[PDB]
């Protein structure tokens, strides 16, 4: 649009990197572990493509990924919390 369309490659490497770390975190906790690489691969890729393609602006893009990682990462520490506790 104006800021989301003028985005650089940095946001791409960061968005995926962050999403992968989170997605893989919950996917590794009890999402498969072995098939994780595959899950996070398609999940992250499809995610970045969804938030980016649906990105309405620089604020919508960051809020999109930040939301997916916040919810995913949270479920990882929340679900594992009881397991470790």
> Which method, experimentally, gave rise to this model?
NMR
The three-class DSSP label of residue 55 is: coil
Torsion from C-alpha of 70, 13, 59, 45, nearest 10 degrees: -70
Q: Is the dihedral of CA 9, 48, 52, 11 positive or negative?
A: negative
For residue 78, CA distances in Å to 4, 60, 71, 72 come to: 32, 26, 10, 10
Domain boundaries, the chain: 1-85
For residue 45, CA distances in Å to 15, 58, 77 come to: 10, 19, 23
Could you name the CATH architecture of 1-85? Answer: Orthogonal Bundle (1.10)
Contacts of 47 (CB under 8 A, 6+ apart): 19, 23, 65, 68
For residue 82, CA distances in Å to 11, 24, 73, 74, 75 come to: 34, 19, 15, 13, 11
């Amino acid at each position: 649009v104006q800021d989301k369309d003028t985005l650089s490659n940095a946001e791409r490497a960061k968005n995926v990197n962050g999403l992968l770390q989170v997605l893989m975190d919950i996917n590794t906790l009890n999402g498969g572990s072995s098939d994780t690489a595959d899950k996070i691969r398609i999940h992250a890729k499809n995610f970045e493509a969804a938030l980016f393609a649906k990105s309405s602006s620089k604020k919508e893009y960051m809020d999109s990924m930040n939301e997916k990682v916040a919810v995913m990462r949270n479920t990882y520490n929340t679900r594992k919390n009881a397991v470790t506790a």
